[PDB]
Structures are given as structure tokens and as C-alpha cells.
Design a protein around this ligand. Structure first.
Ligand SMILES: *[C@@H]1O[C@H](CO)[C@@H](O[C@@H]2O[C@H](CO)[C@@H](O)[C@H](O)[C@H]2NC(C)=O)[C@H](O)[C@H]1NC(C)=O
Ligand SMILES: *[C@@H]1O[C@H](CO)[C@@H](O[C@@H]2O[C@H](CO)[C@@H](O)[C@H](O)[C@H]2NC(C)=O)[C@H](O)[C@H]1NC(C)=O
Ligand SMILES: *[C@@H]1O[C@H](CO)[C@@H](O)[C@H](O)[C@H]1NC(C)=O
Ligand SMILES: *[C@@H]1O[C@H](CO)[C@@H](O)[C@H](O)[C@H]1NC(C)=O
Lengths: 99, 106, 8
């Protein structure tokens, strides 16, 4: 086609070094953090992973803001659907509303 | 203030800086158990204020989430605040009144 | 929390 901008950057000594952690292992770090957050919770930040169901972890994270843990245990479906609709709103914002 | 559950620290004089000695609580030896979000007893969903409901396979315990100190299920560290036909995860067990073995049986 | 001691 025509001469690229990155070829002009590269040909004048302005080379770009790649990161040590590539996108696949960075995604592996992120997936390990997500799996430790869901399965182990906050207890894997103090040594090794300590397994927990996700409802218990969300309950013990409601306990950290002065809210009793009956709020989700009477309204688990509502909080789950609110999280699903909020992450769907984030997905639609990433799809269309680039702001 | 240290990797893990932080307890305290010690300042130490150092050349062009400072050195801390973070005394830190770190758990070592784990053990697997059977858990449940609450306990349905007489249509009441007991679930603890501080402990976590675990069982070794036969009896259920209410020990804390950082050190295994299993205690019997009693309405002193458990609050109801609901009903047991709403939550997803629940098991059938019994919760003993603290009033009973010191006045009612006595 | 009395009625389980005398009113039961
Ligand atoms: C608390 O707010 C939530 C929304 O933030 C309410 O949930 C909605 O309730 C209406 C009732 O007509 C439903 O049509 C919606 O589908 C619900 N949204 C969901 C499930 O995401 C909830 O009802 C409110 N609480 C009370 C007691 O009214
Ligand atoms: C699970 O925990 C229960 C509760 O402590 C254990 O039952 C005890 O077993 C000892 C050993 O025979 C008895 O002396 C106690 O009287 C039992 N407790 C009660 C309340 O009866 C049980 O052995 C444990 N099981 C395993 C596999 O560890
Ligand atoms: C407990 O039992 C499960 C059942 O497979 C096992 O995967 C796990 O390694 C055991 N130990 C711990 C500490 O969870
Ligand atoms: C728990 O016990 C109650 C009555 O004791 C019973 O109606 C209910 O079906 C039981 N639930 C389970 C999951 O066993």
C-alpha cells in the first residue's frame, strides 16, 4: 500500500521492546486471580488458597461494610440478576457507547 | 505492613533509609470440611455473626475463619434475621439453647 | 426470654 508510521519509527532507531509477560500469561494471571477470588476469596492473599462457596464470600464481603449477611441470603437471585444486568450494561457500553 | 495478617512492626535505623520487621500472622496447615450458608432450625435460618458453619462429617461446628477452634452450635454467636425457605444452600441441623442445660435441664 | 422456663 503505502509506507507505515511504525516502519518509519523502527527505521530511525525508535524500536519498541515487547513486554516480558505476554497477553496470554497476563490473561492467565487474571484468570488465576479470578479463580482465587471466586473459589478461595480473600484468604489466598494471606498464604495459600482456602476454598469457599461464592455466596459465603459475598456474605463475608457484605459484613465488611456494616451490613448484615441476611440481605443477600434473602435476596440472592436479585443481587445475581443485578450483577448480570450491570455486566450486560458494561458489555453493551463497550459494544456501542465508546466513551 | 507485611504479606499476610499483619500484627506489628519494628523500625530499625539503616543507612539512607529505614528497615521494618513486620511480625505477621500466616496460617500453615489446612483441612477440608463441609459447609452451609445457614442452619434451618424450626423454620429459622441461623448463620453466625463471626464464625463459619463447618462439619467434619457428623457434627457441625461454628469455628472462626482463621483458626480451627470448633465450638458447639449455640444462640450466642448466631443470629436468625430471616427464614430458612428462601436461601439456596441450607442443611438441617440443631441449635441448642444456652438457657437449657443450666436452667431447663437443671 | 422467660416463657420457656415457666410458661412452657
Ligand atoms: C429494589 O430495587 C430493585 C432494582 O434496583 C428492584 O428490582 C426490580 O423490581 C421490579 C418490580 O416491579 C421488577 O420489575 C424488576 O425486574 C426488578 N429488577 C431486577 C430483578 O433486576 C426491587 O424490587 C427493589 N426492592 C423492592 C422491595 O421494591
Ligand atoms: C467428627 O466430630 C465429632 C464431634 O466431636 C466426633 O464425635 C466425637 O467422637 C469422639 C471419639 O469417639 C467421642 O468421644 C465424642 O463423644 C464424639 N462427640 C459427640 C458429640 O458424640 C467424630 O468422631 C468426628 N469424626 C471424625 C471422622 O473426625
Ligand atoms: C479435601 O478433599 C478434597 C476432595 O477431593 C480434595 O480435593 C482436597 O485436596 C482436600 N484437602 C483440602 C485441604 O481441601
Ligand atoms: C429439613 O427438615 C424439615 C423438617 O424437619 C423438612 O421439612 C425439610 O424437608 C428438610 N430439608 C432437607 C433438605 O432435608
Amino acid at each position: 500500500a503505502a509506507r507505515d508510521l511504525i516502519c518509519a519509527q523502527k527505521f530511525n532507531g525508535l524500536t519498541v521492546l515487547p513486554p516480558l509477560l505476554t497477553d496470554e500469561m497476563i490473561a492467565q494471571y487474571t484468570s488465576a486471580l479470578l479463580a482465587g477470588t471466586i473459589t478461595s476469596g480473600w484468604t489466598f492473599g494471606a498464604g495459600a488458597a482456602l476454598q469457599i462457596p461464592f455466596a459465603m464470600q459475598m456474605a463475608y464481603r457484605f459484613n465488611g461494610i456494616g451490613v448484615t449477611q441476611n440481605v443477600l441470603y434473602e435476596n440472592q437471585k436479585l443481587i445475581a440478576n443485578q450483577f448480570n444486568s450491570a455486566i450486560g450494561k458494561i458489555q453493551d457500553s463497550l459494544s456501542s457507547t465508546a466513551s | 505492613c507485611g504479606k499476610g495478617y499483619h500484627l506489628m512492626s519494628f523500625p530499625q535505623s539503616a543507612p539512607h533509609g529505614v528497615v521494618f520487621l513486620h511480625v505477621t500472622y500466616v496460617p500453615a496447615q489446612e483441612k477440608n470440611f463441609t459447609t452451609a450458608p445457614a442452619i434451618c432450625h424450626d423454620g429459622k435460618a441461623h448463620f453466625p455473626r463471626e464464625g463459619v458453619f463447618v462439619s467434619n462429617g457428623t457434627h457441625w461446628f461454628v469455628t472462626q475463619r482463621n483458626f480451627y477452634e470448633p465450638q458447639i452450635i449455640t444462640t450466642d454467636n448466631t443470629f436468625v434475621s430471616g427464614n430458612c425457605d428462601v436461601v439456596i444452600g441450607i442443611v438441617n441441623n440443631t441449635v441448642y439453647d444456652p438457657l437449657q442445660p443450666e436452667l431447663d435441664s437443671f
